[PDB]
Structures are given as structure tokens and as C-alpha cells.
Amino acid sequence: NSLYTAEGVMDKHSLWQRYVPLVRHEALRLQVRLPASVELDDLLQAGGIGLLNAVERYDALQGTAFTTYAVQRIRGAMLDELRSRDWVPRSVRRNAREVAQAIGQLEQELGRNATETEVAERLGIDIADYRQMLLDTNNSQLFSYDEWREEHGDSIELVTDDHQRENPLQQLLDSNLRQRVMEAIETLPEREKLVLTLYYQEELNLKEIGAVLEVGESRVSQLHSQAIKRLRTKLGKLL
Amino acid sequence: RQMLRKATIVNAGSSDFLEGEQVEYSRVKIANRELEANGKVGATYSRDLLGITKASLATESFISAASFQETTRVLTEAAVAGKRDELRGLKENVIVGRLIPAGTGYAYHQDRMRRRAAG
Amino acid sequence: EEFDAIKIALASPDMIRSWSFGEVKKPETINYRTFKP
Amino acid sequence: QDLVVTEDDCGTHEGIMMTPVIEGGDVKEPLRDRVLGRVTAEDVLKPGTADILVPRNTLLHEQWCDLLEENSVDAVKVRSVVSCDTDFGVCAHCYGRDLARGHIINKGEAIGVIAAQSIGEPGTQLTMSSIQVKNKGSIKLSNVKSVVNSSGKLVITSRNTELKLIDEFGRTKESYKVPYGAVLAK
Amino acid sequence: HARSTGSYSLVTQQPLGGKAQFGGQRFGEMEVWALEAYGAAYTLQEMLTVKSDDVNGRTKMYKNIVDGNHQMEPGMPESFNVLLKEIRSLGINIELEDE
Amino acid sequence: MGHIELASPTAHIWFLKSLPSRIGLLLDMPLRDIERVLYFESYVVIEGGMTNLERQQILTEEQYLDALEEFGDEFDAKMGAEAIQALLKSMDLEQECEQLREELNETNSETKRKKLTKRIKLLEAFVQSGNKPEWMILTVLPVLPPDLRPLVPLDGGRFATSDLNDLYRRVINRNNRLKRLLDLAAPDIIVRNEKRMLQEAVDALLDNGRRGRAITGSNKRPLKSLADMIKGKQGRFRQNLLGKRVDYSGR
Amino acid sequence: REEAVVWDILDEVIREHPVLLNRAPTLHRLGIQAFEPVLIEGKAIQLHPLV
Amino acid sequence: SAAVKEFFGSSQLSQFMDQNNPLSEITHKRRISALGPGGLTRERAGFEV
DNA sequence: AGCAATAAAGTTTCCTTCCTCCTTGCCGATAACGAGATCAACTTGTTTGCGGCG
DNA sequence: CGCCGCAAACAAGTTGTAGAGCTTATCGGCAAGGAGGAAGGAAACTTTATTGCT
Ligand SMILES: [Zn+2]
């Protein structure tokens, strides 16, 4: 690219160009981690753009190096991309790093393992805090089609269960009970008939009717009780 | 007789000169064209043979072809060409799950065929 | 439900337009906890 | 997948001859067995000539195989599968009989289905000088160019020819081909 | 093990296999080929629609049986159109000619 | 389903890496030239304002410069899908059909006659299908619904997912990057890399380890594409569609 | 609760109520057949020897 | 510890044992293969081995 | 038995509200280390097509 | 023309057999915010129960 000025474009670009090797060799050990670590091209693109941004706003009267001003923005772009893919919070991972440092530090202090009361000590905030944190951090996602082990008998997609299933007779008898409701109340007062019909049938408004009559909905109350007393005159399982 | 459902062309005037083609359609055109339709513009023929595995590939329908082997390639070469299968085989009906063009459901299938003929 | 035949064709862009309902713009699915879209 | 019977008879023209598979030794498929339930290509006759028994087509059941094995026929044609002309399908006549049923096929059946499974099922199981007459009979050599050799006997001057032992009646007992200019004793 | 009616898959809604998970049995192509050798269409219609995928089908047939009614109605498998939806995903105007 | 708009076009692979292309098979150009375009190695003539130079004429970015500094204006030569796009866009079918059928008559030697036929029926296909070679590109694509690539939780809150999603994501990231970049008019090289990575992401979505070597997770195992929803035994045909699990059954 | 009437009506239904049988693998079309039930007291099927 | 835990828990070699009868165990530990890493495969390998 | 009143009790709303927390974006201060590979695959195999490849 | 090289691509069926992880290691402060959050409570509003009159 370029600017309004041209010499401050070619000097710009030459500098930009000269410390692409910079982009590289600082990046070349920010390896083994998440598979974009394997990619390395994302890193280069990111580094170039962060470079441009640093370039745009070099501050020269400070007398810092421009590589020194640059490195910050470089790392910023790197870490930004890395934060982009992960979808878990940050202070989470702070605490994770902290337990890592601490638990190793103290495991060498001691020379043996797994006495969590020490974790409660050295990280003396509370037990429940880490006790939650271990949930929060130490559990990552997995995939769906991993084969089931002792050659490919089936996947994980065949060993799955659900709780929100369909069931055919509950709705059946619910509708049965709906016409039983109208059957019960058809001998009872005209508005409450329509109240409970149109609220329970087509899933409309209740106190919309209390506003229509303007009686305070007390007569509603006892009559509703009576409808219950009227439906407690028969038998039905599904309890 | 299913190994042999193709013949290459000798003459021309109906279609391309030597384009590989159904013997059966060749018989059709000449049973239509070389008749009083015309003495001859249509063409004569060699007679072709084809091993089974690609004969099955080399078919009108893409679907059965698309079912078992090298479906992708089928799909490309068909889809470029705005092709269309007509639900006459078995697999064609079992996949969509319609009644068979034969057996018990032969009768309703011929009914549906004359319906296709009758709108 | 009842239909005659199959046909394959090419996917013109405006067919993508007509078929679609809205344009997606970002990589996420959900919250990491509120098990929500 | 595609194949069925479409039509009852295609009214179509001729097809192939069957003559037996006796070669090397004795019969290995009776002409009867081959015929059984075929349909004739044409009106057919008897060694005492001119005795039609199909008007171009019949169910060739064991009555006929018997009726005809009484006599000495050795060759007949049939409206083969291959010669049926029906567009998208076949006739039942060309096919003959349903073995499992025992009669003429009614229209509407699938075929190559049966073919493929019927041949695939056993296939599991199924990987697992001089010429010297033995018995008397007439000799029959056809399509020969040959010569009385210097000795006085016969030697072949055309690779076409092959020896037969034909019985005294006229049906073949044996057949063994003889090389070009091979030395004969007869 | 036996099984009348129970759980299903989710992506394709046809039943599972395994006595542990109340499993339905499998019906292979070979069994199709044999049936075609006989030529009994309606069997297959049922075998593939109602006892496998057609959910409307399974429902209304259950309804009819308990009503004493031993009759049929077909639909279309979901599993079909899935493929269609895969196809268009791949950038293709797959479609169908209405009657 | 839904969709995504793309910044720039890309091209399809079942149209390309498969046996006979239909893409340059049409053009009369080889594969290798075309990769070196679309992998962004070599420029190529669009349309020489000077007939000094030629259509379909390949330009390395060093010899390109000779022609450039000599003339500058009076040629058009680029590298990528847009180039091939306007190229496909340019050509008429009709005349090519007639001239092929014409000069076929001259020397219909068998391999030659074959190839003439080959192209000619391609042409008739493009005509009579109603299709457009314009539409061989890809600038817009669809978004398959969650239900078919879902993500659901486990007993201990853990998750299980479809890799498809993962591939969609990279695509989107790169495209968004590219827009962000384009807003700044940045130097071109990072743009080039951006679109290399673009098309690579794209076709790897379609079919992973075919053109370039495959993408995997941490396990060292592939990020399974579409095509194997349809293929081998595993596909709908041989697994799900022809063979059936069944109720009202036992043993 | 498995009352005796349950078994009575079972006997009532299953007469004339045929079923389908399958061994694996299906080579030829006789690999399956169509039989008629007879209820028995076990958890294993009896089978007519000749098939 | 991760690797150690792994193939003591992840390898195709490490299996449950067959606690059914003495023979079962003692044989199952006297059992030999040429599979797994640095070995072979069923469909590729043929008859000669 | 039908109808209302007073009093009490529990609310659902619901709305603010001010504490506290939590998350989305940015920009910064010493100087220079090296072009990756990294932990794998074991070569099935016969048939068939097509690009060379003369 | 007739090699040669190279690359592609299929490899029985249905049962079951038990359980899954991670080589990892990924600023760091500020701000402003915007959502949430909880408090304890006010308050329509609603709901019960106990005596009055047709
Ligand atoms: Zn016929």
C-alpha cells in the first residue's frame, strides 16, 4: 500500500519488509499448541497486519527502537488470534496458570502429590473456589464420531440418549381431558365457561375477562375451585 | 443381453457420425426413420460389447449409478448436463420408497403409468 | 408430497439467495455456560 | 435391477439352436433337459420328415421330450432370450417356464434378480500322439480338405476338420479333433 | 431380545440396535433382493416407511391397529431429503419435477 | 439452511481434480497451468491490447515485467479466479461449435476426432442444459442447519459436536480478515496469502485430503468433510437408506 | 399383571396369524420363509428339521 | 505420567483380562501378535504370513 | 342455599436501584536469540485411464 | 505410434465386547461499559376465611 507521501511509503514498506524475518523468528517457537500452531500462516498474516498498525503510529521522539515499539503489537495480534479461537474466559485461564505454577512449585517443595488441603492453603482463598474451578477449567470438549474401540463396532453417535422425547398418549389424554373440561363446565356459569375455555383452549388471556366483567375476580376464584371439585368426581391415571 | 445395450454408429444423418449409443435407440430411430419417414437419412451400425461394471455406470439413470460406486463422478457428469431420471427401476422406487414397477404393485404402477400418459 | 420425477441442475447464486433466509457473520455458536444459542 | 417381463408374447422372430454338450465323452446335458419348457423357434419336425408339432411355439414339457426322444432328433431352435425384441422388457414365451412353479410365466416378473442370486449362492462352495476309437460306429468328417497320403490313408489338408464317431443310427457317440495332415489309419 | 416400539435415532429418527438400548433389528439389501424375487411390493413399502422412518406413518398405523384397523398410508422418508439437503450444500440445484 | 456472502470468487473441485475436468477440458488448457494460476504463482494474459501477445498466454511475474515495462497499458494479465471468470464469461459457444464441426471434416484422425467430439458435446451440454459456465465460480454458498451438524452436552456438561462447524469458522475468520485488510488498501502479498488460505479452507470443507494434505484435529485424524456423508458403505445409500433398523422385530 | 385372560386372548389372536423368519446371510430367496405360529414354553424356537 | 497412563489405558495391546477360567488367563497372557505399532494389518496382510 | 363484607395472607410483578461484578475493546517501553521438518507411514493390489513420452 | 509412469480406487454380512483422555500452553493493565443481581421492599393483585342478609 501507500500514503499521501511516497518516500514515507517506500521507507515504510522497506522497514515493513525488513522485519518480516522478525515476524518469523519470534513466531517460530510459538509452536506445538492448538492446530493453528501447526499452520503458521495465520500467524504471518496477523503479524503483518499488526506491523502495519504499529507502523502507522511509530513514535519517534521517544527514541525507542521501532522493532521495540513493534514487538508489542506483534504479540498482541498473535495472542488476539489465539483468543479468537478459544471461547472460554480469560481470568479462568489466569487461575489455571496459577494452579499450574503453584501446584508444581509446591509439589517440588514437598516431593509428592495430591494433598489438596495444601492447595487450600497456598491458594488460601477458599476450598469451594477451586472446587468449582476444577469443573470450570479442567474439562474440555470432545467430538462425536469417535469409533468405539475394538475395531470400529460402532461410534458414539449410536450410544446416545435423550430426555425430551415424544410420547403419544399423554397429548391424547390431555386433549381428552380438554373436552372433559368443557364437558364438566358446560353446566356452570356463562362467562367462566368462556373464561376457562378460551384461556385453556386457544391459549389466550385470563384476566382479560376479569377486566371484561369488572367484579374483582373473586367469583372467578370460588367458581374455579368448584370446577376443580367437579373434576375431582372421576378417575384418571398418568399420575 | 444386458451386457449388450449399445452400438457404435457407422453412417450419419440423424445424429453424430460414430457417437457411442444404445443399439436399442438405434433400432428405434431406424424403426421410425428408415421407414417411410425416409428411405435413409439415419445411419447404420456396428454392435458393441461392454463389461458389466462400467455398463452399470454407463446408464440413463444416474441414481443407481450414484448408489454404490464412483457416485461423485456420475454426479458431476450428469449435473453438468441437466439430466433427469424417470423412476422406472426398482432401486429408484425403493430409495424414494414408492411401489415397485413390478410384482404385486405392477398393476398400480401401470395405473400410474397410464396416469402419466393420462396427465 | 406426491411428485413425478427428479431433476438436477446448477446452483445459480440467486438461487442461493432465494433459498437462504439470512446471512451469517461470526464463528461462534453459543455461550460456554448458558447452554444457549 | 432393471429387468422384468413386460409383455405376454413379443411375436418376435427366431433365435438360437440347441445341440447337445456330449463332447469328450457321453451326454452331459440331455437335449431333453435343455428343451424342458423352452418355446420353439418355429414349426419343427421328425426324422421321418414333415411332422409339425408346434405352430412356432409350445410349452415343451416332458410329454414332448418323451414324444421326441422316441425319435432321434438332435437339434432345435428357440425364440431365445437374446432374440426377443421388446423395448424395455421381454416376452414370457422366449423365457419358457418357471422352474420353481412348473408352468408358463405370467407377465410381471423379475428375472436377472433370480439369475444373479442363483449363480452367486453356489459360488461360495465352488472353488472348493494318437486318436483311438473305443467302440463301433459310422465316421463323419465335415468341412474337410484332405488327401490320400502316399501310404494310401487319409491326411488332412485343412485345419477345419475334426473326427467323429457317429453311431450306426446317425447320432454322435464321440468327437475328437485331428491335426492338419495327421496320419490316419482309415 | 424382542422389541415392539420405543426409542429412536435423532439425526435420522429410525431405531437403534442393541438389547442394552432396546434395539431394533436390521433389514439388509439381501432381504430386499429376495423379496423382489418374489415381488411383494407392499411389504417393502411398510418395511421402509413405517417401521423405519415415516413418523406420521408409525403414528397413524399404531392408531389404526388399536382401533382394529389393519390398513396403510405412506409418506416420504425424511432420510431422503437429508441427502437433498446435503447435495444443495455442496453447491447444486438438485430439485424435483412435480407431477 | 442459510448462507454466506464471499468477498471474492472461488472455484469448485469436483469440477476440477476429478477425471476429465470440464473446466479447462472446455478451454483447451491443461491443469498445471491452471493450478499455477489459482495457487497464485503466475500471471496470465486476459486480453492483449497488443496482438504482440496472445490470449491464454502464461506470464511468470519476471517475464511479465518485461511486457509490463515495455507497454504497461496495452495488455491485461492477472492471476486468479476473477481472471478465469471473465475469461469463461468472454467466450461464445456457437462459433466454436461450428468451427469444430467444420474442421472436424478435414482430418478426423481418431484421437483428434475424439477430442473434437468431446468438446463439441460439452458445448451442446452448456447450451441445452440452459446452464452458464459463469456459474462454475463460487461467490456465495449455503449454511447447513444445526440439526445436521449439531452440538449437544454430556452427563458431566461436556460436549460433542460436528467438525463441519470448525471448517466454517476458519473460512469466516479469513474472509473477515480480508475485509478488514481491504479497508486499508494494504500491500498485496498478504492479500494473496489471504486468498490462498481462503480457497484452501473452502475445498477442504468440501473434501479434505484430495488436493492438499488433510486437516486434522489434535488426534492427528481428519476433520471429516461432507462427501463421506454420501460415500463408501458409510454413506446414506449403503448404511442408512437401503439398509434399515426395524421395530416390531426380534430374534 | 399377566392374568389368565391375557393368555386366552393371546390364543384367540395368534391363530391364523403368520410370521416371517430370517437366517443370515440371505443368499437366495429361500433364506427367509413364512410360517404359522405355535406358542411354546421356553425362550428358544423350535424349527421343522427339513429346512 | 501422561504417556505412561496413556498406553497403560490407550494402547490396542492393553486389555482387560479374561477372568472366566484359569486357562483363559494364563493363555491370554501367553498370547502373541504382530499387530499394533511396528506391525501389520488384516486387510493388507495376506496368506503368506 | 346464593350473595357480599371485612380482614388477613400471600403473592407475582416489576421495577427500580445501588451495590458489585463482569466482560468488550484498546494500547505499551531496556536488547536479541532462528526459515519449519519432529514424530508419523509402511509400501495392499490389480485394473484401468490419461499424460506424457518417445 | 506404443510404451511408461502415474494415479485411482473397490475390497461379505449382522450380532455383540467396554470404557476415553490430551504434548500442550496461550499479556496484562485500563476503562467504560453494559448487563446482571441482589437487596429488601411496595404494591397490584390476588386469594382465604370469618361473619353478615335474601
Ligand atoms: Zn419376447
Descriptive account of the structure:
The structure is cut from a larger assembly and holds 1 copy of chain A (239 residues), 5 copies of chain B and 2 copies of chain E. Chain A is mainly alpha-helical and 239 residues long. Chain A has helices at 7-18, 20-27, 36-39, 41-56, 66-85, 90-110, 117-122, 127-137, 168-185, 190-200, 207-213, 218-231. Chain A has a domain at 6-85: Rna Polymerase Sigma Factor, Chain: A. In chain A, helix 2 packs across helix 4 (41-56), helix 4 (41-56) packs across helix 5 (66-85) and helix 9 packs antiparallel against helix 10. Chain B has helices spanning 23-30, 52-57, 65-68, 71-79, 91-96, 106-117. The two termini of chain B are 33 Å apart. Chain E is built from 4 helices and 3 strands, in the order ββααααβ. Chain E has helices at 29-38, 41-53, 55-66, 78-89, and strands at 2-3, 25-27, 92-97. Chains in contact: A-C, A-E, A-F, B-C, B-D, B-E, B-F, C-E, C-F, D-E, D-G, E-F, E-G. The interface between A and F is medium-sized, with 24 and 27 residues. Strand 2 (25-27) of chain E pairs antiparallel with strand 8 of chain F. Chain A binds a DNA duplex (54 and 54 nucleotides) through helix 2, helix 5, helix 6 and helix 12. Chain A: Sigma factors are initiation factors that promote the attachment of RNA polymerase to specific initiation sites and are then released. This sigma factor controls the expression of flagella-related genes. Chain A: Keywords: Cytoplasm, DNA-binding, Sigma factor, Transcription, Transcription regulation. Chain A: Residues 15-87 are annotated as: Sigma-70 factor domain-2. Chain A: A motif (Interaction with polymerase core subunit RpoC) lies at residues 42-45.
Q: Quick one: overall form of chain A?
A: elongated
Total DSSP helices of chain B: 6
Percentage of residues in strands of chain A = under 5%
Bound molecules: zinc ion
Largest sheet of chain B: none
CATH class of the domain at 6-85 in chain A: Mainly Alpha
Spell out the helices and strands of chain B N to C: HHHHHH
PDB class: transcription
Keywords: sigma28, transcription initiation complex, RpoF, ZNR domain, transcription
Entry title: Sigm28-transcription initiation complex with specific promoter at the state 2
Chain A: RNA polymerase sigma factor FliA
